Design a protein around this ligand. Sequence first.
Ligand SMILES: [Zn+2]
Ligand SMILES: [Zn+2]
Ligand SMILES: [Zn+2]
Length: 178
Amino acid sequence: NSNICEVCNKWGRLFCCDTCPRSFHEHCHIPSVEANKNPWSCIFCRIKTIQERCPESQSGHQESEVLMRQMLPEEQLKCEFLLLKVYCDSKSCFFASEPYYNREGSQGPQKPMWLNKVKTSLNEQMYTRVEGFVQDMRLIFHNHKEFYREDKFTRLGIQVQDIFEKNFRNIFAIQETS
Ligand SMILES: [Zn+2]
Ligand SMILES: [Zn+2]
Ligand SMILES: [Zn+2]
């Protein structure tokens, strides 16, 4: 197995995947690495199995159909993995914890949002449809763009949103378009 966490790229107390060479800190993995379970398979492995059991699940889909899906176990897992893929980018640090807003010439957002809040919401099964999760994720970046206005720091929101959107299109097999 790898000797660094797949998500944060640091060493430490790592839990190893039994079906692939990835390793994880306990709370870097989503869901948090399960207490017992031998063997243990990570989220990358679990997502690969879904695809392997239903190869047609990779044919193209319309975003509007994906969003209205109820959060059954497989969709819950896919949103967990999408969230994890965002945390895998080091620029996610900017969006992880609860923000505050005190900048001359700007007003904070009406509905603040952050990664750890989305993480908690998934853990607590607060989303009934994929749309709930996607809306909160996109609101993280939209709030950031609006608040930072013409400061060049706005680009961090563009960057991490692009990681989110690419992975959303991959994980949920959205139909490719120009
Ligand atoms: Zn980690
Ligand atoms: Zn694995
Ligand atoms: Zn099938």
